[model samples]
Target: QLPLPARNFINRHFTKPEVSHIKIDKEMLEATKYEVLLTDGTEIEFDSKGNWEEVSARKGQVIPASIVPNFAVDYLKAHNFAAEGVTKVERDRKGYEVELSTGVSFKFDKKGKFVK
Candidate 1:
């Protein structure tokens, strides 16, 4: 069974899409990690503590802006792009990666600063 926090994250962001897979990366990273795949083909990740870390949605769909940093969302708007084109918002030890449906991707630092 997925952890309670992971489940709650799904409810908050995805409205409970079909959960197709739950992967546990044990003894893999610095600590255990969980990856969830939804029937809609979206992928989500959570850390050992069951806190969400990433969200990657299928084509033609955008993740909730509430889950994305304000600066990142504003950056898209500043570029004349809309959040509706964002398909992925995945984070890692280094920082966050925001990819749009247009195939344009931006990297943000751990502190949410623009990375070049």
Candidate 2:
């Protein structure tokens, strides 16, 4: 079973599918990971604490704006094209990773400071 946040995320963004396939990573002993796959092919990876570790949007589609950090979006505005078609997003130890449709990826700290 996925954490509450993970379930809510799916319900919040996707209504068409109404159902998703969930996969658990390894043993559920010390640390647990949940991966949710939408029928549309989108994938959401969540950590033990329910922090969405990674989100890969389905083909030819962009992720919800709410999932992307405000600061990240603010920075992206300068290069609006980068803001367009953001397909991959992950929040992990190093912070946010946003990948564009053209394969250009940007890294940012949790506070949204540009890392790369």
Candidate 3:
């Protein structure tokens, strides 16, 4: 059974698409992870706290801009990498890492400042 938070996340982020798979692993020492795959070719993962940790899309699919940080969006717009849009985004303790469809990658602080 999925936690309320995890389920709520999907309810908010995903439309009424068919779910391909759902898995919950409680053995992790740090946090239990919930993984969900949508038939639309999108995948989402949530941590034990029910906060999203990763969002990724299948090839040729672009992640929704609404979920991306504003700073990251501005940076990508200013840089204009030759990609359709963000392919994957992951959040960690320090900050976020994003991958572009152009095969480029970026790191940003929690506040969304570009980082090396």
Candidate 4:
């Protein structure tokens, strides 16, 4: 369960916003992937095509978390990398949780914007 404050913060700061200008850039960097198996029975991640593939294929067609509209822009905005490091993104219903090579981690919402 989410903490009340966290939930409230998300609600107040994260209403639907215009999702134009969201872009996913392919910088020739290594692909960052993770398998998320939520307790709520949601599991989504990347497959060979770098698209979102569910354990249960019936979930829907594969979608690239990075290139997905609104999702990519939000990810780029939230994460910055060190001179020699890189940033990677993962998709979620709200947006992305990006990891920077410096070991910093954070989340961004649709439009590649940070909510917290």
lDDT of each: 0.83, 0.81, 0.83, 0.40
Clashing pairs in 1: none
* Candidate 2 C-alpha RMSD relative to the actual structure: 1.9
The per-prediction CA RMSD against the true structure, in angstroms, equals 1.9, 1.9, 2.0, 16.8
**What is candidate 1's lDDT per residue for 1-116, written digit by digit as tens?**
78888888887877657899999988944888899998888889998877888898877777766787788888889987774578888887898888888898999999888898
**lDDT for model 3:** 0.83
- Model 1 lDDT vs. the true structure? 0.83
What lDDT is reached at residue 29 by model 4? Answer: 65
Clashing pairs in model 4? 73-112, 74-112, 74-113
Q: Comparing candidate 1 with candidate 4, which one achieves the higher lDDT?
A: 1
Per-residue lDDT of 24-97 in model 4, one digit per residue for the tens? 32346664443433333333344334455222111322222333335534444544332322234465567666
TM for every model, in the order presented, reads: 0.85, 0.86, 0.86, 0.33
For model 3, give the RMSD to the true fold. 2.0
lDDT (0-100) at residue 110 of candidate 1? 90
